[PDB]
Amino acid sequence: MPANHFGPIPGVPVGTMWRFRVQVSESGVHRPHVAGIHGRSNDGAYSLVLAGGYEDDVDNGNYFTYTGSGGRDLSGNKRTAGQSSDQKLTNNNRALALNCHSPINEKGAEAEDWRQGKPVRVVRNMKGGKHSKYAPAEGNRYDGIYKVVKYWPERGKSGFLVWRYLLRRDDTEPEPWTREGKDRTRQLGLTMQYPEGYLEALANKEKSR
Template structure:
């Protein structure tokens, strides 16, 4: 499963990520007023592309353009990896950040009746890349990849260390676990 997605960030502090003026009472402005840049959230997605980090995707029923959108509410769609990212001139004449997401999950997609998860497949030819700007492609093996021997997606190298300590909320004297430890527990592939 491969999808091209545009950056749609709309929080005011990330105005360069979304490219929309959200000051005053323009909280839901649909018109772009400046170019999107690879800053903050867009840069985080670009780093995920460069390193091959997995990205969790949640879809909303509000995205009417997508045939994969749920009929109501939110739906967790699984683990994806960003294979390429670039900027292009959008419909309103401003640059928009675009990403090629590829599903790389061991569980079947929620919209299918498959018994297995996604398997690696070749990337498609994207005609829009001919006029793209700031194209980013990964140069090394991704950190989250398909292991042929085990037949599943997993961390090829250990996940990156986090500098943030996650507090469990328990005050029973147990040691707080780091975000890295929490992620490792979450990402362990069960045989």
């Protein structure tokens, strides 16, 4: 797959799991190994990860409200920090807004024919609330295609403006956290994937003090 492919990655079913983000990147399902969103600001967003990293994220499984990135001071060669400035409808935030089936709008937009929007591959990471109903117990899990129904700017918990996006699921395969999804995962033999040599290295490191 080209980097700008929209839609599912062939041969990677819903429910596939990987221990580390770099493995998710290698699969093609989410090519950035740090960033939450993969997008091109004049094309759209191809995928996103829910990893508990923004306090304004709210995950309801078949739908969720995702937060834009940025509004943060990453001075000192940081990757994450708390909010310290307003977010902007630029870069990955603009990309994800362009998936919505409505022209880009600096005040937000909502699509009526929201399935006509561009698909987003969604991965859930283990981090987030304790004993989440949706997050995997370990690693990262591909949960299928979702679509951006609407997006809008709002005052975040921090008091700074954040961009927010409502995504709804649009995938024919069962959600992995449901009974049907757990049955499909069992039948397909989907299990956590680890880097070559990792479990051996772990086994060696566990031999002594």
